[PDB]
Design a protein around this motif. Structure first.
Motif, short mmCIF file in Angstrom:
data_model
loop_
_atom_site.label_atom_id
_atom_site.label_comp_id
_atom_site.label_asym_id
_atom_site.label_seq_id
_atom_site.Cartn_x
_atom_site.Cartn_y
_atom_site.Cartn_z
N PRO A 49 0.81 -1.23 0.00
CA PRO A 49 0.00 0.00 0.00
C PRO A 49 0.84 1.27 0.00
O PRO A 49 0.47 2.24 -0.67
N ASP A 50 1.95 1.28 0.73
CA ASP A 50 2.81 2.46 0.74
C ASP A 50 3.44 2.70 -0.62
O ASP A 50 3.59 3.84 -1.06
N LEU A 51 3.82 1.62 -1.32
CA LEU A 51 4.38 1.76 -2.66
C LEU A 51 3.36 2.32 -3.63
O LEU A 51 3.70 3.14 -4.50
N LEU A 52 2.10 1.89 -3.52
CA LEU A 52 1.05 2.45 -4.36
C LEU A 52 0.86 3.94 -4.09
O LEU A 52 0.62 4.72 -5.01
N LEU A 53 0.96 4.34 -2.82
CA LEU A 53 0.98 5.76 -2.49
C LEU A 53 2.15 6.46 -3.17
O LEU A 53 2.02 7.61 -3.61
N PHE A 54 3.29 5.79 -3.27
CA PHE A 54 4.47 6.37 -3.90
C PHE A 54 4.35 6.42 -5.42
O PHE A 54 5.01 7.24 -6.06
N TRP A 55 3.50 5.57 -6.01
CA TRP A 55 3.41 5.50 -7.46
C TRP A 55 2.90 6.81 -8.05
O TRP A 55 3.33 7.22 -9.14
N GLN A 56 1.96 7.47 -7.36
CA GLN A 56 1.41 8.72 -7.88
C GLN A 56 2.49 9.77 -8.07
O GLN A 56 2.49 10.50 -9.07
#
Length: 66
Positions: A49-56
């Motif tokens: 989930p943190d990586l998905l936050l970072f993807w933006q």
DNA sequence: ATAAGTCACATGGTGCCGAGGCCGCTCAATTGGTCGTAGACAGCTCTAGCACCGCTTAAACGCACGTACGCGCTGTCCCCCGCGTTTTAATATTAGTGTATTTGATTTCCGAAAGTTAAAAAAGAAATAGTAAGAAATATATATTTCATTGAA
């Protein structure tokens, strides 16, 4: 528990007296051997989930700009 | 006299179908071999349960008497049956859904089996306390002596 295979321990299929279905294996926990469990197929979550936050931030500074 | 052509006539040969005989395939049953294992068989030594006998008496049988309950008789009252006539669901006939069991397939579970191995325990010896009998210590009651006091030889 998260049981989706319901298939016995391949190393433990030799002597399949019990099957606790636990990860890595209840029989292996009784056996005290996790390396033998890895040798078989035998069918870590808080970083996605943190990586998905970072993807933006990534796609804004790479694809759109740059 | 004979080569060539005619006509019918009798037979040779080739071909598919039917019936009988042999064979292979498969499944079940039966029997012999074999080997681990258990049962029959002696054999021995020990418990152990009759035969006898004494005996002491608790129990049992016998004779006599009587009265507590078994049965018989007689009333009187309740008390199921018997009809008669109404009511009322059992019951056989379809039937339809919605469970409820059963059969294959399979795949993961659970304990027989064999091999070691450690604990429970069994027997025997020693310690010790319970208990009963015996001997000693001691508290107590009573006789005995001695001195004091007050009445007799």
């Amino acid at each position: 528990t998260q049981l989706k295979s319901k298939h016995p321990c391949s190393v433990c299929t030799r002597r399949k007296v019990k099957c606790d279905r636990m990860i890595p294996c209840g029989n292996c926990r009784k056996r005290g051997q996790d390396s033998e469990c890895m040798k078989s197929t035998k069918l870590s979550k808080e970083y996605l989930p943190d990586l998905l936050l970072f993807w933006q931030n990534y796609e804004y500074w790479i694809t759109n700009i740059g």
